[PDB]
C-alpha cells in the first residue's frame, strides 16, 4: 500500500473566563510537561501527541499520529489546565487529517467534511467540527469510513475444505419446473415468492423434523421465538445499519389509526378500483426498519445490556417462527433464489473456545445429515483466523456438468461482534463470542430435489422413513 | 330536492355537419319522447335542453334522473347520428368532448369536503350536494360517474343512520370457576424471565419457557384438530401485495391497521452510499432521507393470513372429487397496528397464528365449521380446562367468537377474544374467481388460532407454575425448559 504517516492536526482555543496574563508563566511550563508526560499515555515510545505552538483566548496548534489523537488529547489538556488556573488564579479553527492511500478518491457527500484534496501519499481531509463532535469521536468515524473506502479501491478468495465423491445423477430436471408441472407449488403474487401446496410443504416440514431430531435436540438447543419486524435499533447494534440498505424490504407503520385520515385512500379505490400508492406513501410514516433479513439480530435484544452468569453459557437457542426477506437480483428464478424464504436460525453464545467447539459440533451433524439421510453430493469451503463463514455447496444437475453449485448451508463464527454490539458481558469478565447457522429450507429442497427427483421411490431410504406417505396435491381441471 | 344529471358536450366531426341543420334538429326533438324513454318509467327519461352547431362542433345540454343517465343518453344519440349522417351525408363522428358534468344529489344534512379522484369540486346547496366532475369520453364508458354517485350515496345514508355495527348474541357459557391466580400473565412472565419486549411496537421475544407454551398449543391444534379432521399443511406467503387485497376486499378499508412494505427504488449501492455514510459518521439512521429513497408501498405485512393463499386457486376450477379443500398454514407472523398504549401479549402488533381454511359447497362449509367447534370445545374443556364462552357476531354468513375471562381484569373486566370460526360465504371464490366443475356455488370458511391469545387466557387462569396446570396439559408440555438467567 502506502507508507505515508496518518496525521492529525488541530487548531483551536480554550474558552477562558479570566484573561490569560498572570497564567502566562504557568501555562507554558505545563504544556511542556504535557509533552513528556500526559500525552505519552496510550502510545508506543516517541509516537505521543504534541503541541507545536500556543498563543481572551488560549489558542494552540496540536499534532498527533494514530495514538493519543488530537481530538481526545485536547480533553486531556482541558482537565489539566482546569486544576492549574481555577484554584490558583473549545472553539475549533481548523481540523486536518492526512490519510495514506494509493489511488485517487471521489469527493464524498459526507457530513462534517468541508474539503477533500489529494496529496502525495494519500488524501487530506478538512473537517467541519466543533467541541461536541470531537467529544462524540466523530473524526474517528470519518477516518474509519475513509479507510474502508480506501482499501475497497484495492478490491473473492475461496478455499476448499472437504468434498464428497461424485455420484450418478439420473435426474436432470429443474426441480422448480418439475414441481410446478406436478402441482407441488405455484408462484405467489410478489416477486421471488412461492405458495407451497401439500407436497412441497411436506418436504419443508421433513427437513425441519430432521434439523430438530438430528441436530438441535442432540446438541441441547432450546427453542425461542425471535421478532420478525426488525427496527433500526437492532440493525445499528448488529452493524447491518452500515450497509444492508440495498437488500431489504422497508417497513412503514401508518402515521395514525384515524379512519378520517385514511378516508381519501379508501375513496380513491372505490372510484377507480386502483390503489393510490402515491398518496399512501405520503400518509405512511418514515420506515422503522424492515422485514427479517438475517434473523438473529432481533434475538440479541433479549440479552442486550446484560451480564450472563458463567453458569448460563453456552447459550444455545434456535428460531423457526417465520419468514425472511431479501431483495434479490432481478429476473425470475426458482426456489434456488427466492425473495421470501424460510430459515431455521441457530444461535450460540459463550467463550471463544465454546463457540469454536459448538461450530465444530454443528459441522459434524450437517455432515451426518447430508451424507447419511439426504445422501446428496456436496462440498464445504471457507471464505478468506477462525472468525468467518463456512459454506456448504451442492451441484444442481440441471445446470449441467459445468454449472455453479448452490450454497445451501452455512456455519458462521462471528467473534465478539454481537456481544460488543449489543453490550453483553460475561460475569467472569472474559470476552464473549457468538456464532450462528441458518438452515434455508428452500435451498435444501432445491438441492435434494434437483439430485433425487420428485418421486419418493428414488429417495434415500433414510429420507423416505421420515416423510411418511406423501399427501396428495390440489388437483385442478 | 331531486336527483339530476347535467351534461354539456359536443360531438367531433370529420367534415362539417352544416348541410344538415334541419335533419339534425328534427332528430333531437324526436328523442325527447322516443329514443330517450326506453329503460325509464314514463315522465322520467333523458332530455336535450340546448341545441347548437358549428363547422365541427355539435354541442348539446342534457338532463336526466338516475334512469337513462346523461352519459348513457349521449351514447344513444351517438349511433343514431352515425347512421342518419352515415352514407346519406358522408359525415361520421370522431369522439365526445365534455365541458361540464354536474350532478345534484339529495341530502338532508350538510356533508364534509372530501377529495375524490374525478370530482373537481363539491359544494353544499339548497337540497344536498353538487358535484363538478372532471370526465372525458373514456371515463363515462367506464362508469366513473356511476361509481362516484354510489360513493356519495353511501356517505349520505351512513351519515343519516349512523354507524350501527355491533351484533352480539351469546351461544354458550361454561359454569364459573375458582380463579386462584389473579396476576397479569405477561407481567408475571416478564418478572419470571419467560419473555421480554422486542424493539418494535407491541412486540415480544419469547425465552425458552414461553416458546414451549406456544409450541405446546401448536402441537395440540395439530394432534387434536388438524390431523383427525384431515387438514393438509401448506405454506402461505407473508408479504402481501395490493392485487391479493384487491381480490379479498381488504383494499376497501384495512389501511389504518397495516404495516406497509416498500422496496428500495433500486438495488444500486451507489444510490445508498449517502445513507450508509450518514449513518457511519453520525450514528443516526436518516429515516427521512430513506423515506425519499424507498419506493411506493407494494402492499403490507401479513394481516389476515388466508388471502395470499387464494392465489393458489385463483381462476382455477376444482373437480368435485377435490372438495372440501381443508388446509392450514403456520409459516410466520401477522402484523397489525393496534390501538395505542402498551399492552401485554393480549394485544400485540406482531402475532403468531395458525390459519385454517376450508373450501367446498355451502353445506360442506357449514359441516366443516361444526366439526371444528366440537374439537375446540374438547380442547378448551378437557385439555386447557379454562372458563370460556362463545357468541355469534353478525343467515349462516358470520363469525363465532370464543371469549375467556382474565381474572386480573376484575370480576367484571372485559373477556378476551381468543378463538374464531368464520363462514365467509362465496366471498372468496367470487373475489378470486374460483369455480367448481359441477357449477354449484363454492363457499369457504377460516379459523385463526392466535397463540398469544391462547397463552394470555391459559396463563391468566392457571398461573405459570406447572403444578397448578391441568393434568392433560402438563403431559403434553413435558418437562419445562429453564430460562436464560441474567446477573
Ligand atoms: Cl434481521
Ligand atoms: Cl393478509
Ligand atoms: Pt356506442
Ligand atoms: Zn445468524
Ligand atoms: Zn382467514
Picking from B275, B311, B214, B414, the residue whose alpha carbon sits closest to that of residue A290 is: B275
Distance from CA of B41 to the nearest CA of A (A): 28
Who contacts B284 (Cβ-Cβ below 8 Å, separation ≥6)? B278
Strand pairing category for B4-13 and B47-51? unpaired
Catalytically active residues of B are 306, 336, 338, 347, 355, 401, 417, 420, 446, 453
In angstroms, rounded to a whole number, what is the distance separating the alpha carbons of residues B263 and B240?
13
Residues of A in contact with B317 (CB under 8 A): 476-477
Could you give phi then psi for residue B52, rounded to 5 degrees? -160, 140
Strand pairing category for B260-262 and B299-301? antiparallel
- Quick one: cell of A223? 427453542
Q: At what angle do helices B70-84 and B21-31 cross, to 10 degrees?
A: 140
Query: What separation in Å is there between the alpha carbon of A189 and the centre of ligand 1?
Result: 23
In angstroms, rounded to a whole number, what is the distance separating the alpha carbons of residues A396 and A178?
14
Domains and CATH numbers, chain A: 1-154 (3.30.70.1920), 155-477 (3.30.930.10)
- Report CB contact under 8 Å: B301, A287: no
Query: What separation in Å is there between the alpha carbon of A240 and the centre of ligand 1?
Result: 8
Residues of B in contact with A269 (CB under 8 A): 251-252
Residues of A in contact with B330 (CB under 8 A): none
Could you give phi then psi for residue A18, rounded to 5 degrees? -90, 160
DSSP letters spanning A160-199: EEEEPPP------S-HHHHHHHTTSEEE-SSTT-EEE-HH
In angstroms, rounded to a whole number, what is the distance separating the alpha carbons of residues B20 and B89?
8
Per-residue exposure over B442-460, b if at least 16 CB sit within 10 Å of its own CB, e if not:
bbbbbbbbbbbbbbbbbbb
Distance from CA of B109 to the nearest CA of A (A): 19
Task: Answer yes or no: A164 catalytic.
Answer: no
N-to-C CA span, chain A: 68
- Report CB contact under 8 Å: B269, A289: no
In angstroms, rounded to a whole number, what is the distance separating the alpha carbons of residues B336 and B352?
12
Question: Which chain residues have CB less than 5 Å from ligand 1, an ion?
Answer: A 230, 293-294, 297
Binding-site annotation, residues of A: 294, 296, 326-328, 337-338, 343-345, 391, 407, 410, 436, 443
Q: From the candidates A113, A189, A208, which should be mutated to test the interface with B, based on the most B CB atoms within 10 A?
A: A189
Which stretches of B174-307 are assigned E, i.e. beta strand?
195-197, 204-206, 232-233, 239-241, 260-262, 299-301
Picking from B95, B121, B130, B141, the residue whose alpha carbon sits closest to that of residue B5 is: B130
Resolution value, angstrom units: 2.5
In angstroms, rounded to a whole number, what is the distance separating the alpha carbons of residues B206 and B190?
10
Strands of the sheet containing A50-54, edge to edge, are A50-54, A57-64, A7-15, A91-100, A122-127, A113-119
In angstroms, rounded to a whole number, what is the distance separating the alpha carbons of residues A377 and A397?
10
A404 touches chain B (CB under 8 A): no
Q: From the candidates A270, A314, A424, A472, which should be mutated to test the interface with B, based on the most B CB atoms within 10 A?
A: A270
* Residues facing residue A413 across a β-bridge: A388, A435
In angstroms, rounded to a whole number, what is the distance separating the alpha carbons of residues B236 and B332?
9
DSSP letters spanning A215-280: IITTTT-EE-B--SEEEHHHHHHHSGGGT-GGG--EEE-BS---HHHHHHHHHHHHHHSS--HHHH
- Report CB contact under 8 Å: A229, B301: yes
- Quick one: cell of A235? 440493525
- Report CB contact under 8 Å: B487, A308: yes
Task: Identify which ligand lies nearest to the alpha carbon of B140.
Answer: 3
In angstroms, rounded to a whole number, what is the distance separating the alpha carbons of residues B389 and B377?
10
Question: Is residue B96 within 8 Å of residue B78, measured between CB atoms?
Answer: yes
H or E element, residue B239: strand B239-241
- Largest separation between any pair of C-alpha atoms in chain B: 101
The DSSP call for residue A372 is I
Question: Is residue A209 within 8 Å of residue A466, measured between CB atoms?
Answer: yes
In angstroms, rounded to a whole number, what is the distance separating the alpha carbons of residues B7 and B9?
6
In angstroms, rounded to a whole number, what is the distance separating the alpha carbons of residues B160 and B236?
42
In angstroms, rounded to a whole number, what is the distance separating the alpha carbons of residues B99 and B59?
10
Strand pairing category for A307-308 and A425-426? parallel
Amino acid at each position: 500500500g502506502s507508507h505515508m504517516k496518518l496525521q492529525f492536526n488541530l487548531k483551536a482555543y480554550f474558552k477562558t473566563s479570566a484573561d490569560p496574563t498572570p497564567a502566562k508563566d504557568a501555562i507554558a511550563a505545563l504544556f511542556e510537561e504535557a509533552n513528556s508526560t500526559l500525552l505519552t499515555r496510550g502510545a508506543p515510545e516517541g509516537q505521543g501527541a504534541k503541541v507545536t505552538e500556543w498563543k481572551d483566548r488560549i489558542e494552540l496548534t496540536l499534532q498527533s499520529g494514530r495514538y493519543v489523537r488530537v481530538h481526545d488529547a485536547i480533553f486531556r489538556l482541558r482537565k489539566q489546565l482546569a486544576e492549574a488556573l481555577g484554584k490558583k488564579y473549545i472553539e475549533v479553527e481548523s481540523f486536518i487529517i492526512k490519510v495514506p492511500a494509493d489511488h485517487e478518491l471521489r469527493m464524498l457527500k459526507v457530513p462534517y467534511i468541508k474539503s477533500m484534496e489529494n496529496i502525495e501519499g494519500g488524501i487530506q481531509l478538512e473537517l467541519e467540527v466543533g467541541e461536541a463532535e470531537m467529544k462524540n469521536r466523530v473524526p474517528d468515524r470519518i477516518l474509519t469510513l475513509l479507510e474502508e473506502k480506501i482499501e475497497a479501491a484495492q478490491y473473492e478468495h475461496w478455499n476448499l475444505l472437504w468434498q464428497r465423491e461424485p455420484m450418478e445423477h439420473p435426474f436432470k430436471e429443474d426441480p422448480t419446473q418439475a414441481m410446478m408441472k406436478e402441482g407441488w407449488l405455484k408462484r405467489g403474487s410478489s416477486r421471488g415468492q412461492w405458495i407451497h401446496g401439500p407436497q412441497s410443504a411436506r418436504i419443508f416440514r421433513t427437513f425441519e423434523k430432521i434439523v430438530l431430531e438430528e441436530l438441535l435436540e442432540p446438541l441441547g438447543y432450546r427453542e425461542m421465538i425471535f421478532p420478525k419486524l426488525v427496527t433500526w435499533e437492532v440493525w445499528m447494534k448488529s452493524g447491518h445499519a452500515k450497509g444492508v440498505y440495498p437488500e431489504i424490504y422497508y417497513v412503514c407503520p401508518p402515521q395514525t389509526r384515524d379512519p378520517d385520515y385514511w378516508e381519501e385512500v379508501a375513496d380513491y379505490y372505490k372510484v377507480t378500483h386502483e390503489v393510490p400508492t402515491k398518496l399512501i406513501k405520503e400518509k405512511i410514516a418514515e420506515p422503522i426498519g424492515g422485514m427479517c433479513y438475517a434473523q438473529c439480530p432481533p434475538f440479541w435484544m433479549y440479552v442486550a445490556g446484560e451480564t450472563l452468569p458463567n453458569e448460563e453459557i453456552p447459550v444455545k437457542v434456535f428460531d423457526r417462527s417465520g419468514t425472511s426477506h431479501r431483495y434479490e437480483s432481478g429476473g425470475i428464478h426458482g426456489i434456488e433464489r427466492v425473495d421470501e424464504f424460510h430459515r431455521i436460525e441457530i444461535v450460540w453464545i459463550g467463550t471463544k473456545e465454546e463457540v469454536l467447539k459448538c461450530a465444530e459440533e454443528l459441522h459434524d451433524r450437517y455432515m451426518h445429515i447430508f451424507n447419511d439421510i439426504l445422501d446428496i453430493e456436496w462440498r464445504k469451503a471457507r471464505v478468506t483466523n477462525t472468525v468467518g463463514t463456512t459454506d456448504y455447496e451442492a451441484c444442481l444437475p440441471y445446470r449441467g456438468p459445468d454449472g455453479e453449485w448452490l450454497e445451501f448451508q452455512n456455519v458462521s463464527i462471528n467473534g465478539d461482534k454481537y456481544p460488543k454490539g449489543f453490550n453483553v458481558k460475561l460475569q467472569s469478565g472474559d470476552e464473549l463470542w457468538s456464532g450462528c447457522s441458518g438452515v434455508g429450507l428452500e435451498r435444501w429442497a432445491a438441492v435434494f430435489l434437483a439430485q433425487k427427483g420428485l418421486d419418493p421411490a428414488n429417495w434415500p431410504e433414510e429420507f423416505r422413513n421420515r416423510v411418511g406417505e406423501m399427501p396428495k396435491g390440489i388437483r385442478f381441471l
